[PDB]
Amino acid sequence: DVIKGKDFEITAKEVYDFTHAVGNNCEDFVSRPDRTMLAPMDFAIVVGWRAIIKAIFPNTVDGDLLKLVHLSNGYKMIPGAKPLQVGDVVSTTAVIESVVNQPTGKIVDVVGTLSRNGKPVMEVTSSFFYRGNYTDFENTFQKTVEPVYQMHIKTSKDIAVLRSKEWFQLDDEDFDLLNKTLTFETETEVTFKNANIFSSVKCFGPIKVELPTKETVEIGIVDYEAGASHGNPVVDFLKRNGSTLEQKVNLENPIPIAVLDSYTPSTNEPYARVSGDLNPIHVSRHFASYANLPGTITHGMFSSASVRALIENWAADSVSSRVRGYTCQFVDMVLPNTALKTSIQHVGMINGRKLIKFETRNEDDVVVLTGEAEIEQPVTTFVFTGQGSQEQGMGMDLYKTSKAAQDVWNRADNHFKDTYGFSILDIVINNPVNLTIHFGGEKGKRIRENYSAMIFETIVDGKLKTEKIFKEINEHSTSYTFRSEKGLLSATQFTQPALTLMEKAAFEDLKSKGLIPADATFAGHSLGEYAALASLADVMSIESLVEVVFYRGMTMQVAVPRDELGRSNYGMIAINPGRVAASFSQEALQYVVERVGKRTGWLVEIVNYNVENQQYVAAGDLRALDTVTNVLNFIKLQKIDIIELQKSLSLEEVEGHLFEIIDEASKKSAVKPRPLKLERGFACIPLVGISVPFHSTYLMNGVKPFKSFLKKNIIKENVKVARLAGKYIPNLTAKPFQVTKEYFQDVYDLTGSEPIKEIIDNWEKYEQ
Amino acid sequence: MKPEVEQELAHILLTELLAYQFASPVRWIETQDVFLKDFNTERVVEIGPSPTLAGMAQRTLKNKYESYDAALSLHREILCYSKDAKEIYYTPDP
Incomplete structure (x- = not known):
């Protein structure tokens, strides 16, 4: 029967007393202005204590309560649940998970659940050991809740294996099990016969399916019922064929965080008073001798709390919310005024949460306290780089070593070969100057159909023309060659896929290492944007991703008309509004480019908002970019402000005074030939290698065919709103x-x- | 909203958000002023072949978050994957 403990309210005074008592000086536990003061994790056992301990009392759990060892105590912050505060009313439940007659003694496993405002908050596991010779097997039992096992049915042999099982029973027997994700949320009760066999085994629980909407729906039940058994075949089967929703992945090496010398207090009466644990043995010497102990032993729960206060310090960086789980197996009893030395070690990861394996020894170098704790990383965001420096052989160092990286690159490189008849890997590795794609054979025709499926829209004399990318590639085409000056990794349409793969591969490696939290917020700069969504949301497959970003690259390459040399009359400029003047604002820049663009009639727009009054990138007609660089070289030398003078002196005149400086800018700028060289001004650096003014209003036309391309690739059945909602920053x-x-x-x-x-x-x- | 409908509407929104991604200036300053203070993010991991957005986050923090970060007492770790790989992997030397 579920045991209910009375409603315990957390008050500020109780927390101050407890925090002082254990030695936990976490800033989170100090009452500041405009800052709710959190309750400690340890404080949890206090609340539970009345309910939890009451679980070992009932008559059929007979045993000598002087000779009662506390074996281990664990807390597990339920996912989503905020850590406890002051003024929170915390209802407690408890249940006996397990009671087992081990040869030497009885082990009683108690599971406490804390509930704040109707919802459950945390789970407190407590293992107690009655030293004695019990044989009350009929009274023993073990109503475990199994970890949810998730099985991906990829083949039709798995189906025949599942259907062979009698315990596996779907509600609809003809349910299609191919390419599904079944989660078995089983609850396994076992009544024992002897120390080493069972009497009654009853595993059961619903079997869900993941829908395309990422909501699990029940499609059947486990209905396992056995008599005289030596195990559970349901959990055996699931272990052998399923996953645990999250995987413990060790690091290459454990990391020695710190070595810290804790001190047990002379008396346990302060900690006993605050923790409502008045076990005579802890306080009175006469009980301690009659319990055969070596003295009034320091509280075990104190030993835990006096360590969990250091993991919260050193691993969790004096942040409380970061600690989720904390287990501790009290190996040896400890005495008052012992020089406990803790040896903290980071060991590995699970779903972007650190794992810290520590052991504590006394002055004798005897293992006294051991346990582990899983600490969330600092609230982390991801930012993915846009186009930049594409040095030859980026990500190859990772690609040779990392498996995940190998699997990403490979999958992409296979798709590229099959679809567009080249190898990205080759192009990254050796940077070929020219690459020929031959359309010979049935494979060769399919690749030529994939290249003759590409089209873009451009404005032609105020008319939307849906021209053909690779216009020359027709039914009578046998080959087509990409031609670069120095190397094809420099061409946008290989740059963009290459960089996006490197990112995706790096991120996928991080996932393999388990360093990626499940809440991390992700934003990508321009091209990177796509890598993020592939990496954090899985919205596209690797095959869909590369195909998209390739089409993007080619759409941007032919977006603007080029001459026979392959040069447009457009470019980009990197403006620093701090170099021109300290007085020069971002709104002054927006004013200048607006007025030049409106009067001159030439396209010019701010396309990257990079750094506040330090970095902006403006795109448009390279003549107009020559006018604004010559205006911001004029404005600096004359030391004239537009934002001061528009208010402080005259209304509308500063527009008409800029106008006449635009005349001297545009008269010199229009002179130069159409393939002009833009000169490095004071506050304007010409972006080399880029000719297309992307992120502007010039590409309004190019959206329509591009927006259709994503709809073909990006399928709505892969758009997981939870994974995107409140994280993605377009x-x-x-x-x-x-x-x-x-x-x-x-x-x-x-x-x-x-x-x-x-x-x-x-x-x-x-x-x- | 129903998941089967929300899924469709999120799909349609995303599609447009990516289609028009190069049809509008990159509002990165406003993105930086959304993930730094509106999220209070203590760890910016840049994935890329050179630190560019890590230099930009450090310039943003120096320029207009040397008074907000002291007012909350939060430490910010701007870490690029190309350069600062060690502490992101948790792989130091002896």
């Missing part, structure tokens, strides 16, 4: 991704798209 809005009418409206304002305008109008149709 460069379009610069707002945490949320599926609201506000967001849609804001996207429709920035991008005049009819397929969101209809959704905004029909918002209430989608609500119900």
